[PDB]
């Protein structure tokens, strides 16, 4: 699903993010 597939990016804005911080 299209959905799920973006999704992919979406955990990253909060854990790349976070992973960066971190």
Known sequence: ???DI???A???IAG???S???
């Open 16 to 18: 790349h993010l976070a």
């Open 10 to 12: 979406a955990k990253d």
């Open 6 to 8: 973006l999704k992919g």
């Open 1 to 3: 699903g299209v959905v």
């Open 20 to 22: 960066k911080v971190m």
